[PDB]
Amino acid sequence: GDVLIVGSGLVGRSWAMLFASGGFRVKLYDIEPRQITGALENIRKEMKSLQQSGSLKGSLSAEEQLSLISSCTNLAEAVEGVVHIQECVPENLDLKRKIFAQLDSIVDDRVVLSSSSSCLLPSKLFTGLAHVKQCIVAHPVNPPYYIPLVELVPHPETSPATVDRTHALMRKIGQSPVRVLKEIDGFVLNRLQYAIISEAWRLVEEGIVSPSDLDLVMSDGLGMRYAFIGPLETMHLNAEGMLSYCDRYSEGMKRVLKSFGSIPEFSGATVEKVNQAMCKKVPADPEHLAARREWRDECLKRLAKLKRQM
Amino acid sequence: GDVLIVGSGLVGRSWAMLFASGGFRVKLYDIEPRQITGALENIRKEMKSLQQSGSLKGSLSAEEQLSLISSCTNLAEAVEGVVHIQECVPENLDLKRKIFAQLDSIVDDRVVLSSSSSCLLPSKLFTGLAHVKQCIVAHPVNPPYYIPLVELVPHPETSPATVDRTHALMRKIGQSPVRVLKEIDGFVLNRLQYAIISEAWRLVEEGIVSPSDLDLVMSDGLGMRYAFIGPLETMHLNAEGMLSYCDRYSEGMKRVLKSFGSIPEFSGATVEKVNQAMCKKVPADPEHLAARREWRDECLKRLAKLKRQM
Ligand SMILES: NC(=O)C1=CN([C@@H]2O[C@H](COP(=O)(O)OP(=O)(O)OC[C@H]3O[C@@H](n4cnc5c(N)ncnc54)[C@H](O)[C@@H]3O)[C@@H](O)[C@H]2O)C=CC1
Ligand SMILES: NC(=O)C1=CN([C@@H]2O[C@H](COP(=O)(O)OP(=O)(O)OC[C@H]3O[C@@H](n4cnc5c(N)ncnc54)[C@H](O)[C@@H]3O)[C@@H](O)[C@H]2O)C=CC1
């Protein structure tokens, strides 16, 4: 019933706090001692901050949650009595493959071997492993403590049990898992994100709207609805049901989509134009970027609270 | 300094409440007496509801705001002393053209003639009008009282003054206007929306994810960020600035985008599959659709409050 975090970096620390809120004993393992010390320190500080703002997940006190998080130096011992291992090392294929191969030689047939990978495919990560049926990608969204989505991406040989157990576990710790039925480049979130970016880029390039105004169309417009309801249910409600929406607007959708330009090169004049507008709003230096991210995260924290209430 | 609403229907009522919150005297005009009576009644009720939940815009009491809203039977008299006329009749080109032609013969050179049209282009709406320099499309987003975005779409002959004045007026009543520099099919919001829908549709069709799970990827994931920050600034912050983001992810974006399938037909098997999933979540009947929209709107109302606070 214990959980093991391999790599106590940024995402590993978030996972640690999520699992602890669910009452799970969490073990932290890292190749760098300073990352473990830093993780325990930051987790304690973040936990207290959340407590003070009444933003802690679950019903366990910050104190009890912190007591559930410890570190292990020996991997072989670290996997003892663990039912879920969440890998959180850098986004590097060679490295992740090595990690899973090392785990593959010491785990039993019960434990789920889960990767936090942002884009690497399960087929490239787990093929050839003895315990491949227990492998899966459980991709969170930064910042995981505020954004609940977790993309569960299976390997073609991943067992239904592994997917079901992980879906249930993610739900248990307060996250919102989704079943990506078949692996695909960019999974689901990034494919949707890139779809938006592609059209937005061309709109700016063609002089339809300034970069700043395009962002407003989303943040003070379309994005507000998307924080509560997806694009499909949105159609469903903006007419008398999905059938009605297609009957009324499918012609227009096809017409607009047919007018879409080519795939952007993401460089040259347009990157300069977009970057200039972005830097005007938020200077591209460590201080201003961090400050804006902090604001963004606070917004997400409050939105998370609002969503739970609704 | 007065405002005239032509067509006191759903959007006309929203506009009336927006302008009144800004302290503007609002005149309602409609070809159907029952729509005026219904508008005054619903506005009064909505105003009181907002007041009770502490959701009224501006610093004027619900009582004072309501006193600023009245009706006129004669259009010629209705345009007297008005600086902005917001047309809110049905989305029908022949009809809107007739409305603007009727206004064109009685207004001065100061008043702005603004259409709420959801998709009709300024070139089709205002060409040939004597007062074309004063024409513009000011497209709000339902529900306008909670979603601030207003797309300002000009006619090629629309004067800068007309655009500037309307931008300032929209900002004065608490809305978030954007300057769509050149008219285009679907303006900006719908082009972005359709971009998302197109990819989402193919993902469901190809069995990558269920309709319900796809919606969750947005509502409990990507959509949360988009409620505060647009797609471009999002890139800017998810790396060390826009340049950094493109350097790190442009290759992947192009690769994913290149894999995108063709434009959907929005019918057949997939429409049946999507509709079935949507109806399972929200039955396609008047009662359940209205209930879900009510929930959605309440979420947006609270999000609007949250955004203003942040
Ligand atoms: N930062 C976030 O919020 C998110 C991260 N991701 C993914 O999660 C993974 C980790 O990301 P981050 O935390 O941002 O990076 P990071 O660099 O902060 O953390 C990686 C951790 O891995 C440790 N590590 C390196 N080699 C190791 C080894 N052989 N054995 C054990 N530990 C080792 C490092 O010491 C470090 O603490 C990546 O694949 C990333 O794409 C997914 C979603 C969001
Ligand atoms: N409902 C909303 O929230 C939004 C509406 N839109 C656009 O706003 C426009 C109006 O939409 P709705 O309020 O939903 O429809 P609606 O049908 O409720 O309102 C139209 C009003 O026009 C009046 N009308 C019809 N012919 C007239 C004439 N010759 N002179 C004066 N009044 C006349 C009708 O009596 C009715 O009260 C459309 O072009 C729509 O696409 C834009 C954004 C959102």
Q: How far is B157 from chain A (nearest CA, A)?
A: 16
Collapsing DSSP to helix, strand or coil, B102 comes out as helix
* Alpha carbon distances (Å) from B248 to A187, B253, B254: 18, 10, 12
Tokens of A95: 């490295």
- H-helix or E-strand containing B40? helix B33-52
Q: Which sign does the torsion angle of CA A79, A83, A88, A93 carry?
A: positive
Q: Terminal CA-to-CA distance of chain A, rounded, Å?
A: 31
Judge whether B200 and A188 are in contact, CB under 8 Å: no
Mutation test of ligand 1: which of A116, A117, A190 has the most ligand atoms closer than 8 Å to its C-beta?
A: A116
Ligand located closest to B142 CA: 2
Chain A residues touching B119 at Cβ < 8 A: 252
Residues B191, A204: contact at Cβ < 8 Å?
no
| Residues sharing a CB contact under 8 Å with residue A308, sequence separation 6 or more, in sequence order | none
Q: Does residue B143 have a cis bond before it (omega within 30 degrees)?
A: yes
Residues of A in contact with B193 (CB under 8 A): 222, 231, 234
Indicate the burial class of B114 (C-beta count within 10 angstroms; 0-12, 13-18, 19 or more).
Answer: buried
User: CA B29, CA B73: separation in Å to the nearest integer?
Assistant: 6
Going through chain B in order, the beta strands assigned E by DSSP cover: 2-6, 26-29, 69-71, 82-87, 112-115, 135-140, 149-154, 176-179
Contact B239, B248 (CB under 8 A): yes
Extract the tokens encoding A3.
């959980």
Q: How far apart are CA A143 and CA A296, in angstroms?
A: 10
Half-sphere exposure of A171 toward its Cβ, with a 13 Å CA cutoff? 9
How many whole angstroms from its chain centre is CA A268?
A: 30
For chain A, state the CA radius of gyration. Answer: 22
Q: Which of A191, A295, A303 sits opposite B199 (nearest CB)?
A: A191
Residue nearest to atom 27 of ligand 2 (CA): B31
Instruction: Answer whether A245's CB lies under 8 Å from B266's CB.
Output: no
Q: Which two tokens stand for residue B8?
A: 């006191």
Cβ contact B87:B136 at 8 Å: no
φ/ψ of residue B137, rounded to 5: -105, 130
Give the C-alpha separation, A186 to A183, whole Å: 9
Q: In whole angstroms, what is the distance from residue B188 CA to residue B215 CA?
A: 22
Instruction: Please tell me the distance from the alpha carbon of residue A208 to that of residue A196, in angstroms, as a whole number.
Output: 15
Q: Give the 3-state secondary structure of A18-82.
A: HHHHCCCCEEEECCCHHHHHHHHHHHHHHHHHHHHCCCCCCCCCHHHHHHCEEECCCHHHHCCCE
Q: Say if residues A26 and A33 touch (Cβ distance below 8 Å).
A: no
Per the CB < 8 A criterion, the answer to whether B108 and B136 are in contact is no
CA dihedral (B126, B127, B130, B131) positive or negative: positive
**CB atoms near residue B93 (< 10 Å):** 13
C-beta B108 within 6 A of ligand 2:
no
Torsion of CA A71, A76, A81, A82, to 10 degrees: 70
Q: Tally Cβ neighbours within 10 Å of residue B276.
A: 11
Pocket of ligand 1 (CB under 6 A): A 6-12, 14, 30-32, 35, 88-91, 116-118, 139-140, 142, 144
Are A87 and A104 in contact by the 8 Å Cβ rule? The answer is: no
Number of C-beta neighbours around residue B123 at 10 A: 13
Whole-angstrom distance, CA of residue A2 vs CA of residue A304: 27
Contacts of B146 in chain A (CB under 8 A): 224
| CB of B16 shorter than 6 A to ligand 2 | no
Resolution of the structure in the document, Å: 1.9
Q: Do B290 and A249 touch, CB atoms closer than 8 A?
A: no
The residues facing B82 across adjacent strands are: B2
| Distances in whole angstroms, Cα of residue A6 to Cα of each of A32, A36, A70, B3 | 11, 11, 12, 63
The answer to whether A5 and A26 are in contact (CB under 8 A) is yes
Closest by Cα among B102, B99, B79 to B90: B99
- Which one of the ligands is nearest to A92 CA? 1
Query: Which string of b and e fits B187-212 if b means at least 16 CB within 10 Å?
Result: bbbbbbbbbbbbbbbbbbbeebbbbb
Residue carrying structure tokens 């969440």 = A86
Q: Do B219 and A197 touch (CB under 8 A)?
A: no
Return the SS3 of B149. strand
Q: Which of A11, A34, A99 to mutate to test the pocket of ligand 1 (most atoms within 8 A of CB)?
A: A11
- What is the four-CA torsion angle of A218, A222, A227, A231, rounded to 10 degrees? -130
- Which of A81, A99, A82 is CA-nearest to residue A7? A99
CA–CA dist B64, B219 (Å, integer): 38
Strands A176-179 and A149-154: parallel
DSSP H or E segment with residue B275: helix B268-281
Helix and strand counts by DSSP (H, E) for chain B: 14, 8
Is the Cβ–Cβ distance between A5 and A88 less than 8 Å?
A: yes
> Distance between CA B224 and CA A197 in Å, rounded?
16
Helix (H, G, I), strand (E, B) or coil at B183: coil
Minimum-distance CB partner of A199 among B148, B191, B208: B191
Q: How far is B32 from chain A (nearest CA, A)?
A: 24
State the smallest CA–CA distance between residue B137 and chain A in angstroms: 15
Pair of tokens at residue A169: 């576990």
User: Which chain B residue has the Cα nearest residue A302?
Assistant: B306
CB of B158 shorter than 6 A to ligand 2: no
Burial of A83 (0-12, 13-18, 19+ CB in 10 A): middle
CA of B302 to the centre of ligand 2 (A): 26
* Best CA proximity match to B71, nearest among B9, B18, B1, B4: B4
Residues of B in contact with A281 (CB under 8 A): 233
- What angle in degrees, to the nearest 10, is found between the helix axes of B189-205 and A242-258? 110
B112: number of Cβ within 10 Å = 25
**Cβ atoms of A140 and A175 closer than 8 Å:** yes
What token pair was written down for A234? 């949105």
- For chain B, the first-to-last Cα distance in angstroms comes to 31
Q: Residues A261-291, buried b or exposed e (16+ Cβ, 10 A)?
A: eebbebeeebbeebbebbbebbebeeeebee
Token pair listed for A137: 């990608």
How far is Cα A110 from Cα A164, in angstroms, rounded to an integer? 13
Question: How many whole angstroms separate alpha carbon A165 and alpha carbon A172?
Answer: 10
Percentages (nearest 5) of helix, strand, coil residues in chain B: 55, 10, 35
Residues ≥6 apart with Cβ < 8 Å to B88? B5, B6, B7, B8, B9, B11, B12, B15, B116
Asked if B149 and A289 come within 8 Å (Cβ–Cβ), the reply is no
Instruction: Work out the number of other CB atoms within 10 angstroms of the CB of residue A129.
Output: 19
A201 by Cβ neighbours in 10 Å (0-12 / 13-18 / 19+) ranks as buried
All domains of chain A, ordered by start, with CATH?
Answer: 1-186 (3.40.50.720), 187-310 (1.10.1040.10)
Contacts of A195 in chain B (CB under 8 A): 195-196, 198-199, 257, 260
To test the pocket of ligand 2, the residue of B94, B116, B150, B151 to mutate (highest count of ligand atoms within 8 Å of its CB) is B116
Sheet holding A149-154, edge to edge: A69-71, A26-29, A2-6, A82-87, A112-115, A135-140, A149-154, A176-179
**Pairing, β A135-140 against β A149-154:** antiparallel
3-state SS, chain A, equals: CEEEEECCCHHHHHHHHHHHHCCCCEEEECCCHHHHHHHHHHHHHHHHHHHHCCCCCCCCCHHHHHHCEEECCCHHHHCCCEEEEEECCCCCHHHHHHHHHHHHCCCCCCCEEEECCCCCCHHHHHCCCCCHHHEEEEEECCCCCCCCEEEEEECCCCCHHHHHHHHHHHHHCCCEEEECCCCCCCCCHHHHHHHHHHHHHHHHHCCCCCHHHHHHHHHHHHHHHHCCCCHHHHHHHCCCCHHHHHHHHHHHHHHHHHCCCCCCCCCHHHHHHHHHHHHHHCCCCHHHHHHHHHHHHHHHHHHHHHHHHC
* DSSP class of B264: P
Q: Whose CA is nearest to atom 36 of ligand 1?
A: A9
| CA–CA distances in Å: residue B259 to residues A184, A191, A195, B199, B232 | 10, 10, 11, 11, 22
Contact (Cβ atoms closer than 8 angstroms) between residue B292 and residue B219: no
On whether B11 is known to bind a ligand per the annotation, the reply is yes
Q: With contact defined as beta carbons under 8 Å apart, do A188 and A178 qualify?
A: yes
